[PDB]
Write a protein that binds this ligand. Sequence first.
Ligand SMILES: [Mg+2]
Ligand SMILES: [Mg+2]
Length: 1268
Amino acid sequence: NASIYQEFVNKYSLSKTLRFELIPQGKTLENIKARGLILDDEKRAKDYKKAKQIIDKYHQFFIEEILSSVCISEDLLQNYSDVYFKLKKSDDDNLQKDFKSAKDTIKKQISEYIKDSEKFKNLFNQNLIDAKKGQESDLILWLKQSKDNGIELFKANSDITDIDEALEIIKSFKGWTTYFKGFHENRKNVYSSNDIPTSIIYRIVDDNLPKFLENKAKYESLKDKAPEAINYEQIKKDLAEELTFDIDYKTSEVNQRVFSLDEVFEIANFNNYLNQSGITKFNTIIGGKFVNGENTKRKGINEYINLYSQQINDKTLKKYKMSVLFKQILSDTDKLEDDSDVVTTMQSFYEQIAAFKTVEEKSIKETLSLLFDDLKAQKLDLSKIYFKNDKSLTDLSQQVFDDYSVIGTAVLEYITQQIAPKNQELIAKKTEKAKYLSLETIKLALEEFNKHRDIDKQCRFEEILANFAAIPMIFDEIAQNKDNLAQISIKYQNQGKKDLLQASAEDDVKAIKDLLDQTNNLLHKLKIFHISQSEDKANILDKDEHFYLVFEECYFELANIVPLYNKIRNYITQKPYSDEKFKLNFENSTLANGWDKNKEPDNTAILFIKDDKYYLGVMNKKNNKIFDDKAIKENKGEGYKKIVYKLLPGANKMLPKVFFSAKSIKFYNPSEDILRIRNHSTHTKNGSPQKGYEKFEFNIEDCRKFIDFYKQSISKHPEWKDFGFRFSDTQRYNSIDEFYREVENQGYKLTFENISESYIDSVVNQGKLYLFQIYNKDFSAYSKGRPNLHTLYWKALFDERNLQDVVYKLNGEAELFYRKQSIPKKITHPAKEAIANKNKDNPKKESVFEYDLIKDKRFTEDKFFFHCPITINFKSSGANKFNDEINLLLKEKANDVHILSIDRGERHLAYYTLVDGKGNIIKQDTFNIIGNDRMKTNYHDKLAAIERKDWKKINNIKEMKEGYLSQVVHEIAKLVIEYNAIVVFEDLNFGFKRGRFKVEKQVYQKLEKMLIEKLNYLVFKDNEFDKTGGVLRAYQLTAPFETFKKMGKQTGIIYYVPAGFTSKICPVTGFVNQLYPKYESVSKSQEFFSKFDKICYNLDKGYFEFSFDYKNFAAKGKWTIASFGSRLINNWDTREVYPTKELEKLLKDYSIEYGHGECIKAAICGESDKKFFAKLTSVLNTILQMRNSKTGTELDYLISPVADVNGNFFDSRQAPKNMPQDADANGAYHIGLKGLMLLGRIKNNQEGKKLNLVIKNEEYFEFVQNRN
RNA sequence: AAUUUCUACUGUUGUAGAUAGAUU
Ligand SMILES: [Mg+2]
Ligand SMILES: [Mg+2]
């Protein structure tokens, strides 16, 4: 059996960055501290933190200015309003496309306007902090203007005192602009036109515009129905400052005057809002404002509606109240480093909750109590109020009705009888694909659903209303608990102390968590009402404007928990040490940007090799010529070997730029012919000719002529002449890109220069060069074991075997870092003193050490770090169309392939099954045990040992689980190569498992991702260097990871199949239970049992038999289930039940006589008694239960009611080795069967491009049943 | 209970596997 992956190696190139520690050598540290370089860069990091804040202030200013300047045409806004309001009442896919496009053209206008502005162009690049040509810095100009105009910008900021400091901080970065290269990338979004929730455009159109339109419609209707509601004269006198607007967009006339409430609500005048200042003005109009002298609040539109509602004593008028506009991004309104932060932030949050007053001017508790009481009182319109259809509704159904499926089944069935009573995608749109469901729909559906069910089993809508009537009671507990928190807060109020996370405080922490949990859970219950836009649907719906106005107002204030919850939790679970570090550049703006020899004086970083040890060194800025050609000539000696780095990147643009520019032109002497070639670009099929010259058709002789000129010029070039290019004969290539590729592949070359030890020692001794040793425990003298993979890669960079045909390449843009001391150095385990060994199975229970052992020693001392990127498979091309290649490879080699199916068990962390092409199981075992002869570690026992109330334990379990996964991906890899398999996982994107498992969906998703990334480059440490699977040749079975969503049905060699119906199936017969006896009602039970083909007693065998065809009741077949086994009945203690004896008892109890083996079907249908059918369906369900488990015994198994051709029943305990041994093994096995289907579809695919990797349940059932 | 970093460790100044850094 050859390895089907034997030739899948060196397939595609990918980048990786290796990490190492730098150990100062000789007098290096002494000189560095003497110059104080580290402290300077440390201050530079703090100045970075402040500098981000300054650049934020400039961003905020620019947002205001540009948005104030921006105008948008009335036609587009009116198109928006029209499609929007049309979309409210009727949801048409046409209006969906129309709404998206009408929205997108608004965003396009806003973005296209801002991007052409001058302040924006220099905003994200080097020119922001740097002075171009003569021009000074835009940011500095802004700061200087802010000092000249006497505005105090930074008074709010604690870090920055005054504008002079900000100017000095910004000037400090003038050559250091690269410090912000990451920062600017993140801020690039702020102005983006895409779907990002953090954008100025997104807030304008996606957030504020609908609210404004609603406010407009409420204003117009208010004028119509309530003409004297607003006092129009008085609002001008009070709010005049806000009523003043610079430009009227309706008439496009520029004049400064108070605007009429009619004018402010003109759709064209939205442009005066949409920026922070206008948003503030508008909001003041809506809600009113305060003047410091007055002592009373100036009334707003809303208060006028409120008071006029009092005069006429009408509650309807409040339905016209208006929602506040969202504040613009980066507006002037965080991280918890100590106990004071936890205490103060929590106190502030809950004080905000308690003191908040809604639009109705009552507390959140009072508002919600009044609100939900109204919903129960029926006063509200249930046609206009919606439940979100996500897990929130399922959770509601389970909460009140004790079944998650009731509501969904009820609405589906109700709508089915509604729109299609007589007899498909249409009903789905109305129910299953509906993003939000109306309360009216739920009530009607439930009533009609309850009409046919016994009063015993009925589920009532009044229960749901009572459920939400109950919620405000939670507030009382909150109010109580925070009072206790007050006393807890005082002891932890200390400013610098961390003691909250010590052991003595755990009880208080429990109190804190319980409080936060109560609030967070309260939010989760309310989350169902929230209206959240989801992609692929606008989710604009006709709604009660008062209900959602007050509810959204409460919800958004309450929703602040999740940031608070996450921050406090993160604080409690933080590790003893700290990972904080800051960048080290020694006096040089560009440190590692390239290793090139020509750029050595500029970049200042060089690499040495001494014996098997590797050293990095950095020349002092003043003396960077240390290694110039004369010096390496004078000092050549055998002590250290400096690395000579030569690279020709980007051949396509590099060759022409060098040969065809400036003085080089005269040197390289391009001929009149080849100059004609270049100008008209005849050498390129499609390329830009030199501007001013017209593109010509590709001519092959011309291209080859150009190649010849390039070769000649390479021979003349001083540096590239020594690269020793070996080129195919110029006549051989069909395209210029092939020559470029040869140039690029041979362009990277690494050589060494010997340097005397005395020269290195002296030059570091004088402070001229800083020498560090690149180190990890694999480089220690004591380390005889197997090295880290990264250690193998780093060693491989300089290996001669690698240098012949380059696999591992050295990359530029490396970085050095400094990490200060995070913890006291404590001797946890003194030497010569024995230690208990934590591993349960370890033979030696004690270990004795001659040297001290220090917990988390790496963080006890300051340390230097080095991050060096490298390129893997440099000569190989980029990765594309990988799945097609893999599928073809399987197509040819499918005779030899296997299926490795992995599943997260209920009693097992993970389980796998190797399956034959025919479907037999070659091997199955648990992943619980990770071990070699030295050590076996059982993660199942370890994990079960830990199991989780407090935050710290939950975190420890999660972290351990993720690390255990890091172990398991290797086992999977070994099995893949060994057995020639393909990995089959359950699909976690859609169709993920329902139940309770030892490994959560989120963690298992991590496992799938980790296995993808591991199979990107797969190396076995013991495999031979040159041979496949070795350091040079690593199996590449997967394309690089992209996103969880794009994993899809197949990634590389890994296939994701739906997990549905995996664990509930009979292995031999493929039996599935798709007919679920629920005992809906007596009559329905009679109909349900009547559909059975025949129900009788088998006299010879001794068990009852139920025979049926699914056609009468998704699944198809003739089954004839049996009662044979004993079933353990599912926390609370287990009892073993015998279905045969139970049925004997039930039938004997009634008139029915089974003892003759006559068919009972008619007699069963004869009884009208509730009790008979209730117990009968219960017994039948017991018969249908395949998985039986004892909670304490940790034993579960699968047995199936249907019989094979021999009449033997499948039992996991009596099962052979090629059949699943336990209940979880079944699920793994059937995941493999779905993979077998995918294997077959790969095997049989034809010239048609599309391979169908999606497995429908019908296909699943048919395949599984007849195959054996 | 030692680590470029992570998990489990003692597998002995480290052991097995994992490990794309930076940035927000
Ligand atoms: Mg090792
Ligand atoms: Mg540890």
